[PDB]
Structures are given as structure tokens and as C-alpha cells.
Symmetry: C5
């Protein structure tokens, strides 16, 4: 079991850490069919998504995907500082796997 | 996959972007049967709905519809600036497909 | 589809608009069996309920009843101004069908 | 249908109203198996639980028990004044049936 | 039934109470498959997890695991002082069973 987000990252292929140390600049959310997803951006210009749930996801991930969209929304609205994101770099925008918050 | 709301908009027929750059002026919600919906307005008079769930919606949209009504309520109560809305313009009021917030 | 709460209320028999333009004075909620409900009051003495789910309700109302109790709780805790309530005026207390918030 | 918590409490056997007129002093929550419960205290020493769901509860109460734990968590974090609790006074700690907030 | 966290802790093997009397320093959560977990730290370096749901958990714990992650996130975001954690000491990071907040 990992102790931090950087060690969690390293347990997967096609992932990387972004160190943002900043609040979320924009939050976008969609209910349009086949694009039920969220997108966030930071002022350094980087854009990330929470993927549309799909065949790449196992059943145990379904509640965690919804939790992640809830976390991004409330982090955006509280201007909470995002320390790091672990993302899959085989998607565009890069796909969020995990988030750490600290200030 | 789109990187922003405007590009997401462009993947659908009968949609348009409204640029509001303003907080929500009023938030209405209903539990009345066949009208289980939300309506929002802006100061300029613009009025939008989240549609009642129906046969137009695929299974993957059901939770995203509930999420959008959550998002509009907390945007209203935080006075969060709404940048853009993507809407279906073949409905009256215009029906929300996606929202972007930035301030 | 209606554009505001007054027009929505007119789509139903035995309903009434109350114009409160005030924040909720008191919020009460119960988990007691057969009384799983919420009650709000205004400082003028007006009292309203969200009804216990029952055979008067269709299945699409079940999520909207739970949402309405979530809305009343967060409205109460943010001191948000309630503009109007649409209610079934033949229930005692009057039973909430819809709410609009604006300030 | 009752109009206030005191009248609601009088529709049940083995219940009592406590008038606290104070914010929650501590909030405790557990995910330990057979002890999925919450406990709150007030600074006067009064201690209350939300019961572990069990065979004493009917299926309509499932959702309401989860809502009550959500209500006590946000009441505690907002320092919301609790007016009254309706409790089952034969359980130890006394078990919450309903809550009223007013200030 | 226990009346406080310490007494609850003592109903389980391999548990211990940690007295933190401090806010949460970092909050991490993950949707990556098989690592659907949360991790919190405190500024003295203490690190704790909410375990990935698994065959160690009974059905009644599913909801309470999800609630505990919700509680940690909103405690983090409100800088709520955590009084005590009850953890299992046979996992690394130590695994959260219960939390108390008081200030
Ligand atoms: C435009 C439309 O009718 N939308 C309905 C949709 O139809 C499908 C195809 O349209 C798109 C669409 O634009 O919506 C094409 C998009 O590129 C696509 N986007 C992405 C990223 O996937 C989008 C999505 O797949 C769906 O929205 C996901 O739910 O679908 C459309 O071209 C196709 O048309 C067929 C036609 O049906 C045939 O008769 C024949 O002429 O061949 C055409 C070409 O293939 O039909 C597709 C359906 O299989 O399907 C949706 C259900 O999957 C749904 O019916 C959708 O309707 C709209 O729904 C939104 C909310 O989801 C709003 O309510 C909006 O008002 C709806 O649009 C109206 O009502 C519909 C019920 C239908 O009567 C529409 O004509 C009407 O505009
Ligand atoms: C890299 C990859 O394709 N991942 C997909 C996964 O594949 C499994 C194994 O991969 C890992 C992983 O890195 O993700 C190995 C990690 O160590 C695991 N981590 C932990 C902590 O457990 C990780 C997780 O267990 C899973 O992600 C949880 O579901 O799995 C991978 O090594 C193995 O690969 C086989 C391959 O199938 C086979 O043909 C080849 O011959 O040999 C190799 C080596 O055995 O397959 C494993 C199958 O489970 O499988 C998942 C479904 O079970 C996903 O599909 C996952 O894909 C990625 O999902 C995430 C979301 O979770 C992102 O969307 C990401 O973009 C997905 O990856 C891309 O899309 C998928 C559909 C593939 O086409 C993939 O190649 C793309 O890169
Ligand atoms: C007035 C009424 O009977 N309401 C109940 C409803 O009845 C349907 C029709 O009623 C409306 C309504 O005004 O509520 C008509 C509206 O046009 C509809 N609006 C929209 C936007 O669609 C509305 C909705 O469809 C439903 O509310 C959502 O489910 O329904 C009513 O006029 C119609 O009457 C028939 C009659 O039965 C028939 O014999 C006669 O020949 O023709 C007329 C017209 O064709 O019946 C409809 C249903 O059969 O049905 C609902 C369930 O689908 C509920 O039972 C509803 O009752 C009220 O429910 C709300 C909560 O949603 C409150 O609890 C309210 O107190 C309920 O009303 C009281 O208690 C109920 C159980 C009845 O005793 C009612 O008479 C009481 O006032
Ligand atoms: C008092 C009691 O036994 N409560 C259990 C309940 O029993 C039903 C009737 O009780 C009330 C009640 O006060 O709880 C009576 C109220 O008028 C009802 N109010 C409303 C608004 O409807 C109320 C509710 O319907 C239910 O709570 C909803 O579930 O029920 C009780 O009077 C009745 O008694 C019969 C009796 O059994 C029979 O022998 C005699 O001849 O006639 C009388 C008159 O009718 O039995 C009813 C059920 O058959 O039933 C519930 C399950 O439906 C629970 O078991 C409930 O127990 C309490 O549950 C709450 C949580 O909801 C708390 O945990 C509380 O501590 C429980 O009470 C303890 O445990 C139970 C098993 C009893 O031993 C009781 O003595 C303990 O205090
Ligand atoms: C200690 C333990 O093994 N815990 C696992 C549990 O075992 C049950 C009994 O354990 C307690 C406990 O301390 O957890 C005893 C308490 O008195 C109970 N408290 C209350 C209020 O009820 C408590 C709870 O009932 C359960 O935790 C609720 O799920 O259970 C344990 O003593 C007993 O042991 C048997 C033994 O199996 C048997 O061969 C022998 O004949 O007698 C002894 C004594 O009776 O078994 C009980 C189960 O039948 O069972 C749980 C599933 O019901 C879990 O497996 C639990 O493991 C721990 O789970 C938590 C999360 O809930 C953490 O992940 C923790 O790290 C887990 O412990 C380790 O992993 C598990 C899977 C085992 O390998 C265990 O040995 C490890 O310590
Ligand atoms: Ca600011
Ligand atoms: Ca203002
Ligand atoms: Ca005030
Ligand atoms: Ca204070
Ligand atoms: Ca601070």
C-alpha cells in the first residue's frame, strides 16, 4: 500500500506526477451523453480530465470516479491549493488518477 | 475527447454556447411529479433548465443530471461566477448540457 | 416546460405560491419510522413539510424528495433568502412542491 | 402529521425531548464493523448516538439514518445551534430520532 | 454500545488511539484501480489511510467507508481540529476505524 501520492503513481504504467502547488483556475462539468466528465485547468495552462466511465474502469472505480468529481468541485469553490496530481499521460487531457491537497 | 466546453459543445447538434461571466441570480428546484427539474436565471433575464430525466437520456446521463443540479445549487450559494453554458437550443427554456466556472 | 416557479405551480391542482422573501428560521429533520420527513418554519410563523415518501409519489419523485431536504438544510445553514415556495395547501403542514431562491 | 419536533416526539413510545440551545461540542464517527455509528456530545456532558442500522429499523429509515449523520457532521462544522433533540431514552447513549436547529 | 471513541477502540483487536489535537495537514485520494483509498497526514508526520474496500470488510461497512472519506475531506477543507483517531496498527499506513473532532 503506498504512503503518498508519488508512491501510488509509481504502481501504474503510463502515469506521472504534476506538482501544481496552486488552486484550480477553472472547473467544467458535462451531462451530455458519451461526455459525462469533468475538466479542470490551472493558471500555468495545464488541463486535466476525470474520464467518462468506460470499459477501462473496474467496478471498484465507479464510486471513486464520482468522488473525484465531487472533490474537484469543492476544491475549486473553496480555492483549495492542489499540491500534486497523479495522471495517466496516455489520454488528452491527461486523466486524473489521484489528487493531494496541502497548504 | 474535448479539452474545453466550447469544443465539447461542437460535438453535438442543436447546441450553442452562452457566455454569461456572471453569478446565478435565481435557483429554482421542483419535486413535483413530471417536473423533477431545476431552473436558473441570470440578472440579464436569461433562463435555463436542467431537463426532467426522460427517454432522450441514456443510462450514463442519469447520475450526471443529478450532479449538474448539485453543481448549480452550490454555484448559486457560493455566488460562483459562471463563464459559459453549453445548451440544447431546441428546448424552452434552453437545456443545460455543460457548465464552465472561472473567476 | 415552465420558466419560473409560479408557472410551474399552475401546472398542478391544489397548489399555492407563498412569497416569503426571508431566510429559513428553523430546520427540523426526523429518521423516526413513518415520519422520515423535514419541517421548516419562517419567522412569521409559516410552517412547511417535505412529505414522507408514499403512494402519492411516482418513482421519479423519490430522488427529488431527497434533493429537496438537502436543499432546505444547506439553505438554512447559509441563511439563504427563500423567494417563493410552491406548496400543496390541502396537506398540514403545507407540503413543499418547489422552492425558488433569489437575493 | 406533526408541525414541530415536540409533537413528533409525542407520536412515539419511549422518547424524550432534550432542549440544548447550543452547538455540538464533539462529533465522532466510526466505520468499524458492527459499530457503524456516530456519537455527538454537548459541553454540558450530554452524549447522543445515531444507532447502528439494524432490525429495529424499517426500510424507509435507511436513507434517513444516513441523512441524520450528514446533518450532525455539517451542524458540527458550521457551529450551528441545536435547539432540541428527540431521542429514544432507553438506549445508551440516548438514540437520536429527530433534530431541530434554530438561532 | 460505546459512549466515546476510546471505549469504541477497545472493542477491537489490533487497534490503538492516536491523540492528534491538530488539523489535517494533507488530504490525498485516489481513483486508480485497486487503490481506491484516501491518505491523510498531520504536520508532525503521522500518516493514516482509509483502506481500499475489500474482503476484510462486511457489507455494513461499505457506506461507512465512503462516509469516512467524505468526513476527512470536509474536515481538511474546514481546518477542523481532529482530537483522536482510532486506527488498526496491522496495516501501513495505519488504517482509520474512527475519528473524533472537538475544539
Ligand atoms: C441530435 C439528436 O437527435 N440527438 C439525439 C441522439 O441522436 C443520435 C445522433 O445525434 C448525436 C446528437 O447530436 O445528439 C450526434 C453527436 O455527434 C453525438 N455526440 C457524441 C459526442 O457522442 C450525440 C450522442 O451520441 C448522444 O447525444 C448521446 O445520447 O448524438 C443523431 O445524429 C442520430 O440521428 C440518426 C437518426 O436518429 C436516424 O433516424 C437517421 O436519420 O440517422 C441519423 C444519423 O445517425 O441519432 C443518434 C441516436 O442513436 O440520440 C440521443 C440518445 O442517444 C438522444 O435521442 C438525442 O436527443 C437529444 O437529447 C438531448 C439530451 O440528451 C436533448 O434532450 C435534445 O433536445 C435531444 O434532441 C432532440 O430529441 C431527441 C430525442 C431526438 O428527437 C432529436 O432529433 C432531437 O433533436
Ligand atoms: C497499462 C494498462 O493498460 N492498464 C490497464 C490494465 O492493465 C492491467 C495491467 O496494468 C496495470 C496498470 O499499470 O494499470 C499494472 C499495475 O501494476 C496495476 N496497479 C495496481 C496497483 O494494481 C494496474 C491495476 O491493477 C489496474 O489498472 C486495475 O484495473 O494494472 C497490465 O500490466 C496488463 O497488461 C497485459 C496486457 O493486457 C496483455 O495484452 C499483454 O500481453 O501483457 C500485459 C502484461 O500482463 O493488463 C492488466 C489487465 O487488467 O487493465 C485495466 C482493466 O483491468 C485498464 O484497462 C487499464 O487501462 C488504463 O485504465 C486507466 C484507468 O484506470 C486509464 O484510463 C488508462 O488510460 C488505461 O490505459 C489505456 O487504455 C486501456 C484500455 C489499454 O488499452 C491500455 O493499454 C492503455 O494504455
Ligand atoms: C389532483 C390529483 O389527483 N393529484 C394526483 C395525481 O393526479 C393526476 C392528475 O393530477 C395532476 C395534479 O394536479 O397533481 C394533474 C396535472 O396536470 C399533472 N401535472 C403535470 C405537470 O403533469 C400532475 C402530475 O401528472 C402528477 O401529479 C405526477 O404524478 O397530476 C389528476 O388531475 C388526474 O385526475 C383524473 C382522475 O383521476 C380521473 O378519474 C378523471 O376521470 O380524470 C382526471 C384527469 O384525467 O389523475 C392523475 C393521476 O391518476 O396523481 C399523482 C400520481 O401520478 C398523485 O396521486 C397526485 O396526488 C397528489 O400528490 C402530491 C405529491 O405529488 C401531493 O401528495 C398531493 O397532496 C396529492 O393530492 C392529494 O392526495 C392524492 C393522493 C389524491 O387524493 C388527491 O386528489 C389529493 O389532492
Ligand atoms: C415502542 C416499540 O416497540 N417500538 C418498535 C415498533 O413498534 C411498533 C409500535 O411502536 C411505535 C413506536 O413508538 O415506536 C408506536 C407509534 O405510534 C408509531 N408511530 C408512528 C408515527 O407510526 C411507531 C412507528 O410506527 C414505528 O416506530 C415505525 O417502525 O411505532 C408499538 O406500539 C406496537 O405495539 C403493539 C404491540 O407490539 C402489541 O404487542 C400490542 O398488543 O399492541 C401494540 C399496539 O399497536 O408495535 C409496533 C410494531 O409492531 O416497531 C418498530 C419496527 O416496526 C421498532 O421495532 C420499534 O422499536 C424502536 O425502534 C427505534 C428505531 O426506529 C429505536 O431503536 C427504539 O429503541 C426501539 O425500541 C426498542 O426496541 C423495540 C424492539 C421494543 O422492544 C421497544 O420496547 C424498545 O424500546
Ligand atoms: C481481529 C480480526 O481478525 N479481525 C477480523 C474479524 O475477525 C472477527 C473477530 O475480530 C473482532 C475484531 O477485533 O475485529 C473481535 C471484536 O470483538 C469484534 N467487535 C465487535 C464490536 O463486534 C470485531 C467485529 O465483529 C468485526 O471486526 C466486524 O467485522 O471482530 C476475531 O476475533 C474472530 O477470530 C476468530 C478466528 O477467526 C477463529 O478462527 C477462531 O476460532 O476464533 C477467533 C476468536 O473468535 O473472527 C471474527 C470473524 O469471524 O473479522 C472481520 C470480518 O468480519 C475482518 O476480517 C477483521 O479483520 C480486520 O478488519 C479491519 C477492517 O474492518 C482491518 O482491515 C484490520 O486490519 C483487519 O484485521 C486483519 O485482517 C483480517 C482479514 C484477518 O487476517 C485478521 O487476522 C487481521 O488481523
Ligand atoms: Ca480568491
Ligand atoms: Ca454578494
Ligand atoms: Ca445571520
Ligand atoms: Ca467559534
Ligand atoms: Ca488557516
Amino acid at each position: 500500500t503506498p504512503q503518498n501520492i508519488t508512491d501510488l503513481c509509481a504502481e501504474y504504467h503510463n502515469t506521472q506526477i504534476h506538482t501544481l502547488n496552486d488552486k484550480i483556475f477553472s472547473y467544467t462539468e458535462s451531462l451530455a451523453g458519451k461526455r459525462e466528465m469533468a475538466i479542470i485547468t490551472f493558471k500555468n495552462g495545464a488541463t486535466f480530465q476525470v474520464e467518462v466511465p468506460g470499459s477501462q474502469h473496474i467496478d471498484s472505480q465507479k464510486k471513486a470516479i464520482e468522488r473525484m468529481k465531487d472533490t474537484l468541485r469543492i476544491a475549486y469553490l473553496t480555492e483549495a491549493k492542489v499540491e500534486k496530481l497523479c495522471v495517466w499521460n496516455n489520454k488528452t487531457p491527461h486523466a486524473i488518477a489521484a489528487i493531494s491537497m496541502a497548504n
